[PDB]
Structure formats: C-alpha cells, structure tokens
Amino acid sequence: EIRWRVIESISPDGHEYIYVDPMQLPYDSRWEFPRDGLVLGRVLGSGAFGKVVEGTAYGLSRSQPVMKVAVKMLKPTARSSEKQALMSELKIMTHLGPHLNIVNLLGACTKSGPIYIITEYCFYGDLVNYLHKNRDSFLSHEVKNLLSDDNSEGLTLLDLLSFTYQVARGMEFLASKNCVHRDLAARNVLLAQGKIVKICDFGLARDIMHDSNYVSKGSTFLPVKWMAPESIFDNLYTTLSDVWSYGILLWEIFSLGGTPYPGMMVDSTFYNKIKSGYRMAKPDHATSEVYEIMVKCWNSEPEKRPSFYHLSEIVENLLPGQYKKSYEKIHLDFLKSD
Ligand SMILES: CCN(CC)CCNC(=O)c1c(C)[nH]c(/C=C2\C(=O)Nc3ccc(F)cc32)c1C
Ligand SMILES: [Cl-]
Ligand SMILES: [Cl-]
Missing domain, CATH: 1.10.510.10 (Transferase(Phosphotransferase) domain 1)
Known part of the structure; x- marks a missing residue:
C-alpha cells in the first residue's frame, strides 16, 4: 500500500474528497528500461514487503550514461495486490512529473519479471x-x-x-x-x-x-x-x-x-x-x-x-x-x- 494520494475533485461543501485512482491512469511505456542494463548493489533499506537497492544504470540517462540509482522492488512472496500498489506508485510518479526537491522517477522494469522502480540516488x-x-x-x-x-x-x-x-x-x-x-x-x-x-x-x-x-x-x-x-x-x-x-x-x-x-x-x-x-x-x-x-x-x-x-x-x-x-x-x- 502507498500513502500518497492525489486529489481529483472536492464536493461543494466540501466534506468529501475524491482521490484519483492510479490503476485508472495509463502507464507510459516510454519509461521502460531494459533489465540487463541495470546492475544491483547493496540494499539501502529493507522492510516488511520489499526493499530499495543501490544500483547502476547504463544508458538510462543521456546526460549521465553511467548512473548510480536506487531501485525499489517487491519481495518474492509478492502478494498480488502489492504488485498493483507498486505499479500504482509508478503511475503516480509519472502523473506528478519531476521536481528538484522530490526523489524523481527515472525508469522502470515491468515487462518480464519482478517490477522495478528506478529512482534518484541520494548520497547522504x-x-x-x-x-x-x-x-x-x-x-x-x-x-x-x-x-x-x-x-x-x-x-x-x-x-x-x-x-x-x-x-x-x-x-x-x-x-x-x-x-x-x-x-x-x-x-x-x-x-x-x-x-x-x-x-x-x-x-x-x-x-x-x-x-x-x-x-x-x-x-x-x-x-x-x-x-x-x-x-x-x-x-x-x-x-x-x-x-x-x-x-x-x-x-x-x-x-x-x-x-x-x-x-x-x-x-x-x-x-x-x-x-x-x-x-x-x-x-x-x-x-x-x-x-x-x-x-x-x-x-x-x-x-x-x-x-x-x-x-x-x-x-x-x-x-x-x-x-x-x-x-x-x-x-x-x-x-x-x-
Ligand atoms: C549513513 C548510514 N546509513 C544507515 C544509518 C546508511 C548509508 N546510506 C543510507 O542510509 C541511505 C542512502 C545513502 N540512501 C538511502 C536510501 C535512498 C537513497 O539514497 N536514495 C533513495 C531513493 C529512494 C529511496 F527509497 C531510498 C533512497 C539510504 C537508506
Ligand atoms: Cl516549481
Ligand atoms: Cl525558482
């Protein structure tokens, strides 16, 4: 499950908020990045349902061709609703667009295996x-x-x-x-x-x-x-x-x-x-x-x-x-x- 919520509409009162549902939004396949190119490092943070891992992406960025990035992935146990929540997080990132002061989406591996969300690496x-x-x-x-x-x-x-x-x-x-x-x-x-x-x-x-x-x-x-x-x-x-x-x-x-x-x-x-x-x-x-x-x-x-x-x-x-x-x-x- 994800905490983030984007507001779609408010009732006129307005005592009722309506939040966008990610599964409704479309995944832009442009974000897709070949899995072989990505290299996975030591785990940055581990939790109950997955982990973020340090990594290196080759050719993901035109500006930097050898980049160090953090990857988010689900645990193998991988309850099916959790897999959708990760796609949901991915769609929300795509919808918001980038900003200097958020951890930005860089790419994703969704096609053939566990889903990977590629994100900016924060050195400190x-x-x-x-x-x-x-x-x-x-x-x-x-x-x-x-x-x-x-x-x-x-x-x-x-x-x-x-x-x-x-x-x-x-x-x-x-x-x-x-x-x-x-x-x-x-x-x-x-x-x-x-x-x-x-x-x-x-x-x-x-x-x-x-x-x-x-x-x-x-x-x-x-x-x-x-x-x-x-x-x-x-x-x-x-x-x-x-x-x-x-x-x-x-x-x-x-x-x-x-x-x-x-x-x-x-x-x-x-x-x-x-x-x-x-x-x-x-x-x-x-x-x-x-x-x-x-x-x-x-x-x-x-x-x-x-x-x-x-x-x-x-x-x-x-x-x-x-x-x-x-x-x-x-x-x-x-x-x-x-
Ligand atoms: C400094 C000592 N720390 C343990 C206390 C370990 C050192 N490093 C760290 O903690 C650490 C570092 C250096 N990055 C992360 C995590 C992320 C990061 O960098 N970019 C991300 C982007 C997304 C995300 F979901 C996590 C990270 C950690 C936990
Ligand atoms: Cl701004
Ligand atoms: Cl400014």
Missing part, C-alpha cells in the same frame, strides 16, 4: 540520520556559495535553513499537483549530492512494525506525532495537514534530529494534550523566526495555516539573496538534465 541518506551524524560538528554563526555544494565544512544554521527552504519548495510542487503526502517527516526527506533535499515516500522499503514512531490504529499504524489534529481525530488528510507535519519536521531539523515531543509517549493523555492546544517549545537551535513558522503551521484551524507557496517566501527572506540565486541556477540545470 535520510535527513534524520544525517543530522545525528553531524550533531557534534554543529556551530551556529562565500559561506552561501558553498551551501548547495558537496564541499566539506561544519554544519551551520544556513544549512538548516537550506533544508527548510528546499522541503517547502518540494511541498509546493506537491501541493500544486493536489498531492497530499500524509507522512511528511525528516525520515522521509533524503539528501542528494550537492546537498539537495528530496522528499519521498520510504513506505514500501520501510517496515512500520519495527519503527518506533508509528502507533497502531484500527489495523493500521499512523505517524501520530506528525499528524494534524483533524487527521488524528477526524481522519482527514489535506495539504493543510501536511503543513502541520512540515512544522513538526522543522522542529526535527532545528533540534538536530530530536524526537518530537521528547519524553511524551503517544497515549490517552497525549491526545488530550494535542486537543488541549499543547504545542512544543522552541528547540535549542531554532532562530526566533523559524519557531514562529512552526507555530503558524501548528494552528488548530487548518485554513489559518500558511500555504506551502507562502512558506517558501518566508524562508527565502531568512536566507541571503545569493542563496536564491544559487537555487535558481540548480533549478535550471536540473530541468535541462538529459
């Missing part, structure tokens, strides 16, 4: 792991030119703001396609060479059962600490509830990978506190301004939360003018790729 791994690895090196404080490069220096507040801006940009693209993530968290944000953040669903390769954050509910498991109240209590997911998750994500970022609501376990009294209006306090490294962003995203009234487009502007003003220049260039280069 998940954001949460990366923050933990660079925790001790953190100092607050031509620094701007280095930010969107692989050059080696201590993690700084500019980096954290760069991650913040890019995730917002990523959401805007997603929001702009009426796509609701429903599992936005630092564990679902990967980092690519050049320090480009890429939002993605880890779901098929990750196992929820082993992961501590997910809490059981009606035969499913929910990222409760990242969920807006309407998602918790009323089971409604919108772009506005993703904005809530984004605020929690910023807390993760500016606490250098801390667990949200530290010391608080998800129980009867937790739900009462979220319903009470409890919000987290400012994390240690959060600038006064960023915390204001977190608070705005945590508004109890969903329509009062800022739009993802709006957030990008707010973060852009917390960053030097040269950074936006550097991002626009990398934006164009990415679009010209291949």
Whole structure:
C-alpha cells in the first residue's frame, strides 16, 4: 500500500474528497528500461514487503550514461495486490512529473519479471540520520556559495535553513499537483549530492512494525506525532495537514534530529494534550523566526495555516539573496538534465 494520494475533485461543501485512482491512469511505456542494463548493489533499506537497492544504470540517462540509482522492488512472496500498489506508485510518479526537491522517477522494469522502480540516488541518506551524524560538528554563526555544494565544512544554521527552504519548495510542487503526502517527516526527506533535499515516500522499503514512531490504529499504524489534529481525530488528510507535519519536521531539523515531543509517549493523555492546544517549545537551535513558522503551521484551524507557496517566501527572506540565486541556477540545470 502507498500513502500518497492525489486529489481529483472536492464536493461543494466540501466534506468529501475524491482521490484519483492510479490503476485508472495509463502507464507510459516510454519509461521502460531494459533489465540487463541495470546492475544491483547493496540494499539501502529493507522492510516488511520489499526493499530499495543501490544500483547502476547504463544508458538510462543521456546526460549521465553511467548512473548510480536506487531501485525499489517487491519481495518474492509478492502478494498480488502489492504488485498493483507498486505499479500504482509508478503511475503516480509519472502523473506528478519531476521536481528538484522530490526523489524523481527515472525508469522502470515491468515487462518480464519482478517490477522495478528506478529512482534518484541520494548520497547522504535520510535527513534524520544525517543530522545525528553531524550533531557534534554543529556551530551556529562565500559561506552561501558553498551551501548547495558537496564541499566539506561544519554544519551551520544556513544549512538548516537550506533544508527548510528546499522541503517547502518540494511541498509546493506537491501541493500544486493536489498531492497530499500524509507522512511528511525528516525520515522521509533524503539528501542528494550537492546537498539537495528530496522528499519521498520510504513506505514500501520501510517496515512500520519495527519503527518506533508509528502507533497502531484500527489495523493500521499512523505517524501520530506528525499528524494534524483533524487527521488524528477526524481522519482527514489535506495539504493543510501536511503543513502541520512540515512544522513538526522543522522542529526535527532545528533540534538536530530530536524526537518530537521528547519524553511524551503517544497515549490517552497525549491526545488530550494535542486537543488541549499543547504545542512544543522552541528547540535549542531554532532562530526566533523559524519557531514562529512552526507555530503558524501548528494552528488548530487548518485554513489559518500558511500555504506551502507562502512558506517558501518566508524562508527565502531568512536566507541571503545569493542563496536564491544559487537555487535558481540548480533549478535550471536540473530541468535541462538529459
Ligand atoms: C549513513 C548510514 N546509513 C544507515 C544509518 C546508511 C548509508 N546510506 C543510507 O542510509 C541511505 C542512502 C545513502 N540512501 C538511502 C536510501 C535512498 C537513497 O539514497 N536514495 C533513495 C531513493 C529512494 C529511496 F527509497 C531510498 C533512497 C539510504 C537508506
Ligand atoms: Cl516549481
Ligand atoms: Cl525558482
């Protein structure tokens, strides 16, 4: 099963959303890539129903003819409905199109054997792991030119703001396609060479059962600490509830990978506190301004939360003018790729 959902229509009220169904959408066979060409490496992440594997693609890209990529595939056991869910994920990726700040679809092997989804390889791994690895090196404080490069220096507040801006940009693209993530968290944000953040669903390769954050509910498991109240209590997911998750994500970022609501376990009294209006306090490294962003995203009234487009502007003003220049260039280069 896949978490991602694209909105097709809303009732006039509108208390009823209608989500596109992937199986309805057509798989463009242009994406097909010969299996022999692909080479499979060590497994990036393994879970209950499949895994993501590092790999190398030859001739997949005109720009880069020898490319390193991450491949998603189902386990052999391969329950038939799961096989459709992977095609579904593939169709959704095709429908959304590409963006700099998502893990992008590159190709697929669907014709003769297990289905393979080829995707961008993110050299630095998940954001949460990366923050933990660079925790001790953190100092607050031509620094701007280095930010969107692989050059080696201590993690700084500019980096954290760069991650913040890019995730917002990523959401805007997603929001702009009426796509609701429903599992936005630092564990679902990967980092690519050049320090480009890429939002993605880890779901098929990750196992929820082993992961501590997910809490059981009606035969499913929910990222409760990242969920807006309407998602918790009323089971409604919108772009506005993703904005809530984004605020929690910023807390993760500016606490250098801390667990949200530290010391608080998800129980009867937790739900009462979220319903009470409890919000987290400012994390240690959060600038006064960023915390204001977190608070705005945590508004109890969903329509009062800022739009993802709006957030990008707010973060852009917390960053030097040269950074936006550097991002626009990398934006164009990415679009010209291949
Ligand atoms: C750094 C230590 N890590 C274990 C804690 C192992 C190192 N590497 C890692 O974690 C790692 C890296 C470097 N990439 C991934 C996963 C993906 C990746 O890169 N692109 C993707 C695209 C799609 C996808 F679904 C997963 C990945 C991991 C888990
Ligand atoms: Cl855009
Ligand atoms: Cl731009």
